[PDB]
């Protein structure tokens, strides 16, 4: 089992802000222990091999050759308040794709097969 | 929640881990393992001002 | 993004849940009486924190003066 949590950090800066944000998420895990978002709730009961964060999406891989993906939405006025996509978009399985490795690219996600097949589907669309 | 309540709960938890007949064979290692500062639980207790914790550990 | 692990007694101790810690110990000892939770307990006792800290380190570290 696991709990999915995210943090946001302005790109130009030192490491102290990142460490402080990690401390805040630790305290929330301890002082608050808030539950994770429902869209990734299912992936709570599944293991993870590698994860990738794209320009607006993020894909997560199970050890059993299964992948999932979801975007997000971050509120800057209030600045895990970031709320992901409503429905987690899956990857339909046909003829045993058998994912092993993945990769993050600006225009598309990259996936591997057991024999080696550079499957990819763009973030904007919803078809492999 | 309260500081006094937190301390009482911490002392109760320490005593619970002390009088756990289940974990007797493993306590020999649990109190002998080292943290990243190269110290046992007792040394960490005495450095962090956890003096009653150090006494109970000893 | 991160997927933090789930070690029940570690969370209970670091959050100072006396009732939950007692319940976990009671369930563990009942299962040990059932003799079906020996190896799993042996694996669990080595659940750690950041810096190779066993459960006792968390216990003492949640006991420092306020």
Curated annotation (Swiss-Prot), chain A:
Signal peptide: none annotated. The modification Phosphoserine is found at residue 80. It comes from the Eukaryota. It is found in: Nucleus; Cytoplasm. The modification N-acetylthreonine is found at residue 2. Widely expressed. Most abundant in testis and expressed at high levels in brain, pituitary and kidney. Belongs to the UBR5 family. E3 ubiquitin-protein ligase involved in different protein quality control pathways in the cytoplasm and nucleus. Mainly acts as a ubiquitin chain elongator that extends pre-ubiquitinated substrates. Component of the N-end rule pathway: ubiquitinates proteins bearing specific N-terminal residues that are destabilizing according to the N-end rule, leading to their degradation. Recognizes type-1 N-degrons, containing positively charged amino acids (Arg, Lys and His). The UBR-type zinc finger forms a pocket that mediates recognition of type 1 N-degrons. Homotetramer; composed of a dimer of dimers. Associates with CDK9 and TFIIS/TCEA1 and forms a transcription regulatory complex made of CDK9, RNAP II, UBR5 and TFIIS/TCEA1 that can stimulate target gene transcription (e.g. gamma fibrinogen/FGG) by recruiting their promoters. Associates with the E3 ligase complex containing DYRK2, EDD/UBR5, DDB1 and DCAF1 proteins (EDVP complex). Binds TOPBP1. Interacts with PIH1D1. Interacts with CIB1. (Microbial infection) Interacts with human T-cell leukemia virus 1/HTLV-1 protein HBZ; this interaction modulates HBZ stability. This is E3 ubiquitin-protein ligase UBR5. It comes from Homo sapiens. The lineage of its organism: Eukaryota, Metazoa, Chordata, Craniata, Vertebrata. The gene is UBR5.
């Amino acid at each position: 089992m696991t709990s999915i949590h995210f943090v946001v950090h302005p790109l130009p800066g030192t490491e102290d802000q990142l460490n402080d944000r990690l401390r805040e998420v630790s305290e929330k895990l301890n002082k608050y222990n808030l539950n994770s978002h429902p869209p990734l709730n299912v992936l709570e009961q599944a293991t993870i091999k590698q994860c990738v964060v794209g320009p607006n999406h993020a894909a997560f891989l199970l050890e059993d050759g299964r992948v999932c993906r979801i975007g997000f939405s971050v509120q800057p006025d209030r600045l895990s308040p970031v709320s992901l996509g409503e429905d987690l978009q899956w990857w339909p399985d046909k003829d045993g794709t058998k994912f092993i490795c993945i990769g993050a690219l600006y225009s598309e996600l990259l996936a591997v097969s057991s024999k080696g097949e550079l499957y990819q589907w763009k973030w904007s669309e919803s078809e492999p | 929640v309260e500081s006094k309540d937190r301390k009482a709960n911490a002392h109760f938890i320490l005593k619970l881990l002390c009088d756990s007949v289940v974990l007797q064979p493993y306590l020999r290692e649990l109190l002998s393992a080292k943290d990243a500062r190269g110290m046992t639980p007792f040394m960490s207790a005495v450095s962090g001002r956890a003096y009653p914790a150090a006494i109970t550990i000893l | 993004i991160m997927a933090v692990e789930k070690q029940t007694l570690m969370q209970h101790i670091l959050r100072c849940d006396y009732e939950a810690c007692r319940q976990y110990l009671m369930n563990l000892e009942q299962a040990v009486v059932l003799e079906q939770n020996l190896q799993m307990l042996q694996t669990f006792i080595s659940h750690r924190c950041d810096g190779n800290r066993n459960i006792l380190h968390a216990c003492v570290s949640v006991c420092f003066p306020t």
